[PDB]
Each structure stands twice: as structure tokens, then as C-alpha cells.
Swiss-Prot record:
One Pfam family per UniProt: DeoC
Signal sequence segment: none
Protein name: Tagatose 1,6-diphosphate aldolase 2
UniProt catalytic activity: D-tagatofuranose 1,6-bisphosphate = D-glyceraldehyde 3-phosphate + dihydroxyacetone phosphate
Annotated keywords: Lactose metabolism, Lyase
EC numbers, comma separated: 4.1.2.40
Keyword Cell wall biogenesis/degradation belongs to the record: no
Gene3D superfamilies linked to this entry: Aldolase class I (3.20.20.70)
GO biological-process terms attached to the record: 6-sulfoquinovose(1-) catabolic process; D-tagatose 6-phosphate catabolic process; lactose catabolic process via tagatose-6-phosphate
Molecular-function annotations in GO: 6-deoxy-6-sulfofructose-1-phosphate aldolase activity; tagatose-6-phosphate kinase activity; tagatose-bisphosphate aldolase activity
Annotated pathway: Carbohydrate metabolism; D-tagatose 6-phosphate degradation; D-glyceraldehyde 3-phosphate and glycerone phosphate from D-tagatose 6-phosphate: step 2/2
Family: Belongs to the aldolase LacD family.
Length: 322
């Protein structure tokens, strides 16, 4: 575990993971498609990932990229930034309820390490209350990956995105009502030794947009209830865990971290994506590479710098977990 520990250190600063997430594929294409009539190209996708990597990794402990479009971007990251690579095929088949995991066809943990990565990240969709046989298949799949990573001596970062088989839209009030249970129970399953997880990458256990004080519409939760969901999450695992930002704004994500910390969560960092760099997409598409670069240096930098200042007072070192 000395090789894993020193990889873990390459992904962190002072035992805190302050990482930039840009393995988005499907979601990035949908964003780019809003601003031009032509289909987003391979060249366009590769270039924007490269710009964000070159410009913002000086201010991140590591960057998460996908092997499909992100390999050029991985090669321009700052000297001090570690690399994580995504291992799962993107998205999911919405015509079925199972969302079964599937690794990229020509990739292995060994090849990911040979690409210069210090971690393998894998995203799993998980409904704790879903079909038991579907769940058995998923658990066996994660066992395999965790074994691969042990053999190649590379940290395994498991991303869990929760869902309910019975609910199509995870932004809805009916999903917000069961999110805490979905998130916290999933973490308990995948914290077991047999899965070989080094770091859990997880959602905050509340949709803050339905919490009193944050909410503009229906209120579902008091702040106390929200705070308890965070404590329940903290008690769900002894593993290092970090928060993904998903589609929330920079400011809402920052406010959530302060709230998590005040509640008693001992999260160990974040993998923050769209909140930090989303504004660059429209600029890239409408005005080009140089204009995107100028946005990244000014506005992008401000988003990430403001994130780092919040992390310095909210996040806890993972060194106190192993």
C-alpha cells in the first residue's frame, strides 16, 4: 500500500483532494450543442479539455480526464497536478431501468496506468432498492475492478451516482425525498473490504434546492434535517470520500461545503467540474480558443481560487483515515 499511498499523495495537497473534474463526454457535447448548429467535433472536444487542463491545473491537486477525448489534455497538465482517468463508458441506456456498468472496451487498469494515471476512476449507477439480481451483477463488476487496481497498485476511485428505478428525473422533489437513503446506503455497501475502494466519490446526500433558506420553490427539508443527512453520510463509511459537484453552480457548491462542514461531515476534498469551467463552453464555441483561454485565466481562475479558499476551511485530511 506504499505505492497506493504515494499515488494518493500525488492526487492531493496536504491530504486534501482539490481536484478538477473534466471527464464529461455526453454532458459536454450537449452543452456545446446549445451554441452552434454543427455537431461538436472531436477536435473541438479535445481542444477545450486541453485549454482547461493547461490553464487551471496549476490551481488543482489533480485532474480527472476521460481516455476517449482527454489524453491530449492529460499531457498538458501542470507539473504538480496528478492525473485520474475514467474507466466506464459514458452515460446509460435510459430505455432500461438497470443501468448496468461497462468498462471502455480497449481499456484495462494496466493500460490506464500506462497512460500516466495515478488513479483509476469508475462511475457506477446504483439504486439500493432496485432489482437484487441487477445489484448482484453490479457488485461482482466492482469486485473485478477493485482487484485489477490492487494488482496494478493504483488507487481505485469509485464514483457512485444514485437513482431510483421508479423515478425518471433525479432533479424532482420525489427523488429529493429519498436521496439521502440512496446515497448513504450505497456507501455502506461499497465500503466493504471486498470492493477494494480507496476513495469514494459521492453526491451530497441532500438536494439543497429543496432546503429552507436555499429553496426558491417548495421546501421539503429544514436545515436541521439537511444537517443530519450529512452526519448520517459521515457515519456511512470509514473510507476517504470526496464530493462531486454535478451540475450545480460554483456558488451553490461552495455554500454546500460550508454547510457540510458546519453539519459535521469530514469530507476529504472534491472533484469539481462544471461549476468551475462551464462558462468557458459558450465562449469557446462562439469566439474560439484564444477567447476561451482568456476566460479561463480570469473568470475560470476566480472560480477555482474561490473554491480552494473554501476547501482550506472546510475539508479534512484523508491522512486521518488510513
Amino acid at each position: 500500500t506504499e505505492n497506493k499511498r504515494k499515488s494518493m499523495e500525488k492526487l492531493s495537497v496536504d491530504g486534501v483532494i482539490s481536484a478538477l473534474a473534466f471527464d464529461q463526454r455526453g454532458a459536454l457535447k450537449r452543452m456545446m450543442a446549445q451554441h452552434q448548429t454543427k455537431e461538436p467535433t472531436v477536435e473541438q472536444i479535445e481542444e477545450l479539455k486541453s485549454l482547461v487542463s493547461e490553464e487551471l491545473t496549476p490551481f488543482a491537486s489533480s485532474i480527472l480526464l476521460d481516455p476517449e477525448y482527454g489524453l491530449p489534455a492529460s499531457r498538458v497538465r501542470s507539473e504538480e497536478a496528478g492525473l485520474l482517468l475514467a474507466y466506464e463508458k459514458t452515460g446509460y441506456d435510459a430505455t432500461t431501468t438497470s443501468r448496468l456498468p461497462d468498462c471502455l472496451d480497449v481499456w484495462s487498469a494496466k493500460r490506464i496506468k500506462e497512460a500516466g494515471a495515478e488513479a483509476v476512476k469508475f462511475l457506477l449507477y446504483y439504486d439500493i432498492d432496485g432489482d437484487q439480481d441487477v445489484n448482484e451483477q453490479k457488485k461482482a463488476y466492482i469486485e473485478r475492478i477493485g482487484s485489477e487496481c490492487r494488482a496494478e497498485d493504483i488507487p481505485f476511485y469509485l464514483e457512485i451516482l444514485t437513482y431510483d428505478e421508479k423515478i425518471a428525473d433525479n432533479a424532482s422533489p420525489e427523488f429529493a425525498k429519498v436521496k439521502a437513503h440512496k446515497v448513504n446506503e450505497a456507501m455502506k455497501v461499497f465500503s466493504k473490504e471486498r470492493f477494494g475502494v480507496d476513495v469514494l466519490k459521492v453526491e451530497v446526500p441532500v438536494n439543497m434546492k429543496f432546503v429552507e433558506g436555499f429553496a426558491d420553490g417548495e421546501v421539503l427539508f429544514t436545515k436541521e434535517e439537511a444537517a443530519q443527512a450529512f452526519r448520517d453520510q459521515e457515519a456511512s463509511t470509514d473510507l476517504p470520500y470526496i464530493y462531486l459537484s454535478a451540475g450545480v453552480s460554483a456558488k451553490l457548491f461552495q455554500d454546500t461545503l460550508v454547510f457540510a462542514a458546519e453539519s459535521g461531515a469530514k469530507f476529504n476534498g472534491v472533484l469539481c467540474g462544471r461549476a468551475t469551467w462551464a462558462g468557458s463552453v459558450k465562449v469557446y464555441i462562439e469566439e474560439g480558443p484564444q477567447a476561451a483561454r482568456e476566460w479561463l485565466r480570469t473568470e475560470g481562475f476566480k472560480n477555482i481560487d474561490e473554491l480552494n479558499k473554501v476547501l482550506d476551511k472546510t475539508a479534512s485530511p484523508w491522512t486521518e483515515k488510513m
